[PDB]
Amino acid sequence: NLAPLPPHVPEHLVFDFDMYNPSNLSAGVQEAWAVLQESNVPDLVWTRCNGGHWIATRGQLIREAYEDYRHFSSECPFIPREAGEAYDFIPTSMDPPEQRQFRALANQVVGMPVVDKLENRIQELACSLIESLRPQGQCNFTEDYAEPFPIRIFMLLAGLPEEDIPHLKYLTDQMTRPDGSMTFAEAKEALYDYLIPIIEQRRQKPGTDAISIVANGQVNGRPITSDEAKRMCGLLLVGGLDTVVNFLSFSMEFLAKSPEHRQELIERPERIPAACEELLRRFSLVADGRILTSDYEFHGVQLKKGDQILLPQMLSGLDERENACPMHVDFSRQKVSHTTFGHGSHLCLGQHLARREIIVTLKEWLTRIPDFSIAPGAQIQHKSGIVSGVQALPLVWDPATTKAV
Ligand code: HEM
Numbered sequence: 001n002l003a004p005l006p007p008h009v010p011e012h013l014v015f016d017f018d019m020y021n022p023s024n025l026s027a028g029v030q031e032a033w034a035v036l037q038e039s040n041v042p043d044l045v046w047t048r049c050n051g052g053h054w055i056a057t058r059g060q061l062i063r064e065a066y067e068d069y070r071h072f073s074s075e076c077p078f079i080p081r082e083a084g085e086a087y088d089f090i091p092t093s094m095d096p097p098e099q100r101q102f103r104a105l106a107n108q109v110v111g112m113p114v115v116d117k118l119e120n121r122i123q124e125l126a127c128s129l130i131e132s133l134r135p136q137g138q139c140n141f142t143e144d145y146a147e148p149f150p151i152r153i154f155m156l157l158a159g160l161p162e163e164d165i166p167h168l169k170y171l172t173d174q175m176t177r178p179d180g181s182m183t184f185a186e187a188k189e190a191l192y193d194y195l196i197p198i199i200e201q202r203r204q205k206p207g208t209d210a211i212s213i214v215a216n217g218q219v220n221g222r223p224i225t226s227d228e229a230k231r232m233c234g235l236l237l238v239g240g241l242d243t244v245v246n247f248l249s250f251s252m253e254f255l256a257k258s259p260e261h262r263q264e265l266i267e268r269p270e271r272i273p274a275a276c277e278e279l280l281r282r283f284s285l286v287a288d289g290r291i292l293t294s295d296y297e298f299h300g301v302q303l304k305k306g307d308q309i310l311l312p313q314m315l316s317g318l319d320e321r322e323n324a325c326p327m328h329v330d331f332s333r334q335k336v337s338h339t340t341f342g343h344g345s346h347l348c349l350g351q352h353l354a355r356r357e358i359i360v361t362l363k364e365w366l367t368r369i370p371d372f373s374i375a376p377g378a379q380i381q382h383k384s385g386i387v388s389g390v391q392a393l394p395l396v397w398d399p400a401t402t403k404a405v
């Protein structure tokens with residue numbers, strides 16, 4: 001289901017890439033996308049899939065377009081257009097200067113200072129989860145770790161019931177990796193139905209949790225509106241529930257297949273941080289976009305007002321012009337170049353938290369379970385979308401090679 005090519009589009013710029021179901025999926029999701037960067041592919045393509053939209057294929061263009069909010073508006077950041085349109089999250093669906101007051105409040109909630117306060121819990125949960133798995137000699141890493149670890153931390157931060165996870169997680173997933181089961185607007189509303197009463201409650205009676213702080217915040221000197229708070233909290237949820245979770249499964253699938261990479265990290269822990277960045281570059285997973293505010297000519301291509309463009313953050317650090325031998329994982333790259341957390345005014349406030357969680361996982365897993373692999377005859381499936389993911393991750397190990405801490 002291809003949409004008819006609009007008049008302004010040169011047919012030589014056509015490359016029908018399905019962000020929800022790319023052709024090379026079996027190879028790995030990063031590998032499916034990376035098709036976009038082959039020699040046969042122009043820098044700026046038009047896809048007839050998912051209603052028709054441009055895609056920038058190179059790090060140089062992606063960065064440029066991210067910097068340029070004047071032309072590339074966040075007002076409609078998701079594809080398909082109906083999704084982009086229903087999209088009302090704060091501060092993500094706003095351009096500067098309006099975005100700033102909101103970002104500033106989001107940052108109070110998820111920023112460094114919060115990470116620093118949550119450290120011991122992050123550590124405590126990881127060690128608790130891993131120690132619990134260790135003696136088993138096998139898990140479902142996605143379900144057994146990647147999901148609980150980050151989500152239980154977020155639930156704790158937000159002051160929400162762990163019981164709500166399954167419902168919440170389903171809804172967040174419909175938004176990034178739609179099933180057809182629900183439209184975006186519907187998923188969005190259900191999430192909002194959830195949030196509304198909570199916000200009310202926290203406006204009347206303030207906690208110290210993330211939601212209580214957002215609900216009672218000041219922005220441009222006056223108090224945040226209930227609708228505003230609902231719109232920030234909605235984003236905080238998708239961020240917390242759908243990001244780190246997918247990231248850890250890609251990284252663990254790689255560690256499982258690469259003993260040499262595991263060893264390195266065991267012997268020379270001083271490299272953990274560097275390895276983390278390199279994993280963030282290699283297993284990049286987010287792709288959203290922007291909307292043209294007007295007619296514009298970008299790198300010789302005519303963009304029309306209202307066109308959407310996908311600016312795949314995942315792609316920048318996969319770009320040969322940015323990284324020599326991109327698909328190769330090398331812990332000692334002189335320069336790890338990526339835009340994994342985005343670029344421009346919308347750079348991820350949740351990045352400090354995301355790194356702390358990744359570094360603790362790596363440190364803590366490798367300590368106790370140094371030797372593991374993917375289960376004999378399990379087939380690892382990737383899933384593509386706004387945020388890509390791994391279906392299931394069956395791991396096996398010999399209990400006897402583990403170390404109790
Ligand atoms: C590996 C993990 C993550 C990745 C790769 C990631 C990626 C991104 C990207 C690419 C953007 C900007 C998108 C755009 O410009 O439209 C973004 C923004 C944001 N992310 Fe992260 N995210 C991650 C984890 C988190 C976490 C754990 C949270 C906190 C709950 C979070 C909260 C946010 C927020 C609040 C923004 C909006 C900032 C603004 O609009 O000014 N993210 N993220």
Ligand SMILES: O=C1[C@H]2C[C@@H]3C[C@@H](C[C@H]1C3)C2
Nearest residue numbers: 089092238239286288386
């Ligand atoms: O609306 C969202 C923004 C862009 C990406 C990452 C995070 C959660 C979802 C998908 C921030």
